[PDB]
């Protein structure tokens, strides 16, 4: 929904390279056990910087989380997904056929 | 139909890296219950005995919303959104959560206790991988609560990996310090252990690892 | 697999049977029960003794009732369909011993009086537990003091 | 009419059972084990009796 | 197969056998002689796990102060038959469900039966009390087996040295009440086992 | 009577609907159940305001058996807790100051 | 209309999200004056 009118999505925000990048390294197998406090201190502190925590926030907690339903919403699409990507991308059956 | 796969992929790892997300910003939007916690207490409040609410929202929370994902999604990937972002913002958690007020002596026991009971439950998800968080942080936000010098000199020689040890051990050096600077009243204090901290800074704590700046 | 009440649940389980379908819809029933005490444990650690005394109180509580529900419904219904209900039963007093030392991560033992006093509360109708709670204390007997 | 058979059904069943019981435990109440443990007759309440 | 040897006689005037073609029914009672004897060893293994019960503080220095029963020896060996006669009843009905259970009956007895020999003096270590204890945990075995496994039974109830005497009968025979009590709590548990 | 849906012929969301009913319907008449629990407080006096509370949750709890009855059922009967406060609290000494007459 | 008083939930109305997306409290930004002292606090 973004088309950010008028919402500070503070996760889409959080969708932000090299953050977002490295967090599809931390994405790759996941991560593999090199869950980088670097990486994750940097980019998920880093927009979060902004308060930081801190101290005396100016900050979330119903700032701007998704609700309830869209995470329900989410959850299910992605389970949706993970029900596709099995049976769906099974077939390539090489090359044309 | 690389292309296709390719990008199906491509909604698998963006819809599970917001549910990371969704799951970790909840973790660091929880974190300010202390944001405010109604002033932290100066050297003691005793008693100091509990709990803190929206950590014991946040324990909440999180024990359903794991419930739920284990219902529905499938086992691995939440294994590891869940691992991988709770125990990480479990401990920058406490990194940039050191950064909060004059502290307390019971009050040390009392943030000590809710962060070993946040680390009850975030090893309530998970304990019997490296739920090293506890261990990291208790020592090193308990290491905040430690008031002594040595201590400060002698740990983080051979612990903590504790990367924002600008602020940590400015911090730490804010909590001997947080002791020190009411420890009078006006003044509240004469910083003559703060002078012992001026040098310390130089010495205790800008003998920071060979690079010797802090 | 969706109505939280009785009346359907009793209902379309006789029903089930009367079509002569009862080993699926016992275990179909007992997997009712398992998401219904499943979902119960979803009201809310606050603190320890409290929270096993709960927790003991739901399951077992709940597993007595489904033993009256059995007898009830399974009228006739010979010893292999018992079984059935005796494999589902020390399912989920195994996954209590695990909901305990699930935090055990960190007691003290009106806990364990709580839970033994229930257990014997399985045996008004007759069903040891007790020594498997024994050999749980048996090999957990670090913070049980 | 149907409200009122509700509330009657909980406030005059219910919680007269509920701190009937417990009883045995003491609070601990009004919530999930009481939810749990009532539970009883005249739980039959919401299959037809508005609907 | 022998319905399609004997089918398969039919145009076939060959004779319709020389059963030595059966060999490979031999091959097949070899299978079957594989098959259930597979699983029947590791049951077996599984019982050999008996042995952790009852000989670690199982009548031990026992006072066994009348919980009836108290049979962790018997409790948990006839929970995991109850188990495996549990999930094997319904497709496998009158397999060795009743084959299997007999053979129970009888490696329970045998492995059970010479635990009481170390313990043949008959108060040990605390055991005054509890020989009528191991005279119940004793007496739960009749549940529903047959009659030579309750002959070893009353063998192995005759084991230790008292365990000679009548009075341990008929005394046996007055406590047969608190076995009663067992026989209702538990009851519903092993009642699958009748 | 709403939720007896063999559902759903809407089928918006695939049960769920009628959270945003009585969602809205406890937003609304929440601020208007606010003052009139507020104004209003002292028109809702230190007799059955324990029978209002008492029907009322009662009526908070026995919901569906929930299904999102939270801000009007934490918030509203906590502020009635605070109502019962202040009134048994001028109903304390201050007007047991006889005995300091 | 949107003075420093009325520019928030009157710009958020039922058809008054025939006013722009971004542009709800900007929505004399079709105007000279745009929403007078910071028009644009809303879509972050």
Redesign the interface.
């Not at chain 1, 088309?3 to 500070?8: E, F, V």
């Not at chain 1, 308060?51 to 926030?57: F, N």
């Not at chain 1, 900050?59 to 700032?63: E, H, V």
């Given at each position: 929904g973004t088309?950010?009118?008028?919402?500070?999505r503070?996760?889409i925000t959080?969708?932000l390279q090299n953050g977002?990048l490295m967090?599809?390294e931390?994405?790759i197998l996941?991560?593999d056990?090199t869950?980088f406090?670097?990486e994750?201190?940097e980019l998920?502190?880093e927009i979060?910087h902004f308060?930081?925590?801190?101290?005396?926030?100016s900050?979330?907690?119903?700032?701007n989380?998704?609700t309830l339903?869209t995470?329900?919403q989410?959850?299910?699409?992605?389970?949706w997904?993970?029900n596709?990507?099995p049976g769906?991308?099974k077939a390539?059956n090489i090359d044309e056929v | 139909k690389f292309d296709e796969t390719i990008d199906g992929f491509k909604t698998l790892k963006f819809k599970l890296i917001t549910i990371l997300r969704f799951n970790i910003r909840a973790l660091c939007i929880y974190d300010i219950g202390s944001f405010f916690q109604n002033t932290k207490i100066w050297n003691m409040d005793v008693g100091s005995i509990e709990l803190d609410q929206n950590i014991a929202s946040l324990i909440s929370e999180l024990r359903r919303t794991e419930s739920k994902l284990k219902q529905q999604l499938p086992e691995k990937e939440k294994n590891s959104i869940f691992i991988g972002l709770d125990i990480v913002n479990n401990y920058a958690l406490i990194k940039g959560a050191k950064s909060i007020k004059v502290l307390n002596h019971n009050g040390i026991k009392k943030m000590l206790r809710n962060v070993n009971v946040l680390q009850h439950a975030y090893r309530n998800l998970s304990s019997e991988p490296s739920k090293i968080n506890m261990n990291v942080t208790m020592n090193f936000y308990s290491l905040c609560g430690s008031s002594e010098a040595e201590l400060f000199e002698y740990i983080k020689d051979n612990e903590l990996p504790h990367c924002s040890v600008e602020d940590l051990k400015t911090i730490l050096r804010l909590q001997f310090s947080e002791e020190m600077h009411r420890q009078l009243k006006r003044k509240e204090q004469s910083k003559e252990g703060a002078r012992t901290k001026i040098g310390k800074l130089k010495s205790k704590l800008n003998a920071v690892h060979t690079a010797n700046e802090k | 697999l969706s109505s939280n009440e009785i009346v359907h649940l009793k209902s379309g389980t006789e029903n089930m049977i009367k079509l002569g379908l009862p080993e699926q819809a016992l275990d179909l029933f007992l997997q009712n029960r398992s998401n219904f005490i499943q979902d119960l444990i979803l009201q809310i650690v606050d603190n320890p003794t409290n929270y096993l005394t709960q927790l003991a109180v739901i399951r077992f509580q709940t597993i007595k009732k489904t033993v009256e529900d059995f007898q009830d419904i399974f009228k006739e219904l010979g010893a292999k369909i018992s079984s059935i209900l005796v494999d589902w039963c020390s399912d989920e007093v195994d996954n209590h011993f695990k909901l305990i030392d699930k935090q055990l991560l960190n007691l003290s033992p009106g806990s364990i009086k709580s839970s033994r006093k229930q257990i014997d509360g399985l045996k008004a109708v007759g069903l040891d537990f007790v020594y498997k709670l024994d050999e749980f204390i048996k090999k957990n007997s670090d913070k049980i003091r | 009419v149907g409200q009122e058979f509700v509330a009657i059904y909980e406030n005059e069943l219910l919680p007269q059972w509920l701190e009937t019981r417990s009883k045995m435990k003491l609070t601990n109440f009004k919530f999930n084990s009481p939810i749990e443990i009532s539970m009883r007759d005249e739980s039959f309440l919401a299959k037809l009796n508005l609907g | 197969a022998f319905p399609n040897i004997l089918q398969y006689f039919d145009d076939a005037f060959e004779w319709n056998l020389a059963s030595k073609n059966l060999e490979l029914f031999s091959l097949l009672s070899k299978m079957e002689s594989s098959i259930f004897g597979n699983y029947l060893s590791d049951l077996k293994i599984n019982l050999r796990d008996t042995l952790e019960e009852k000989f670690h503080e199982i009548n031990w220095p026992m006072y066994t102060s009348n919980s009836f029963r108290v049979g962790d020896y018997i409790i948990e060996a006839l929970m995991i038959l109850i188990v495996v006669h549990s999930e094997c009843f319904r497709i496998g009905p009158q397999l060795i469900h009743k084959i299997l259970i007999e053979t129970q009956i009888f490696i329970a007895r045998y492995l059970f039966e010479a635990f009481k020999p170390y313990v043949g003096n008959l108060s040990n270590d605390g055991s005054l009390q509890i020989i009528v204890d191991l005279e119940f945990f004793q007496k739960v075995m009749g549940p529903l087996l047959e009659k030579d496994t309750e002959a070893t039974l009353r063998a192995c109830l005759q084991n230790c040295f008292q365990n000679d005497t009548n009075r341990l009968q008929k005394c046996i025979n007055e406590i047969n009440p608190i076995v009663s009590a067992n026989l209702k709590r538990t009851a519903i548990q092993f009642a699958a086992f009748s | 009577d709403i939720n007896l849906n063999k559902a759903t012929e809407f089928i918006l969301v695939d049960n769920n609907y009628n959270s945003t009913n009585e969602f809205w319907d406890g937003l609304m008449d929440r601020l208007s159940p606010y003052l009139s629990y507020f104004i209003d407080e002292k028109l809702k006096t230190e007799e059955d305001m324990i029978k209002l509370k008492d029907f009322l949750c009662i009526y908070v709890a026995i919901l569906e058996n929930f299904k999102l009855n939270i801000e009007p059922l934490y918030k509203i009967l906590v502020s009635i807790f605070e109502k019962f406060c202040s009134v048994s609290l001028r109903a304390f000494d201050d007007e047991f100051q006889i005995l300091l007459n | 209309t949107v003075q420093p008083e009325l520019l928030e939930s009157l710009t958020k109305e039922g058809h008054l999200a025939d006013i722009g997306r971004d542009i709800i409290q900007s929505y004399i930004s079709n105007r000279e004056d745009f929403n007078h002292d910071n028009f644009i606090n809303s879509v972050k």
């Open positions: 088309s950010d009118r008028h919402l500070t503070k996760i959080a969708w977002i967090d599809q931390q994405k996941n991560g056990e869950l406090h670097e994750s201190i998920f502190k979060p308060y930081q925590a801190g101290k005396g926030l900050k979330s907690d119903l700032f989380n998704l339903d995470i329900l989410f959850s299910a699409s992605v389970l997904i993970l596709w990507l769906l991308k390539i | - | - | - | - | - | -």
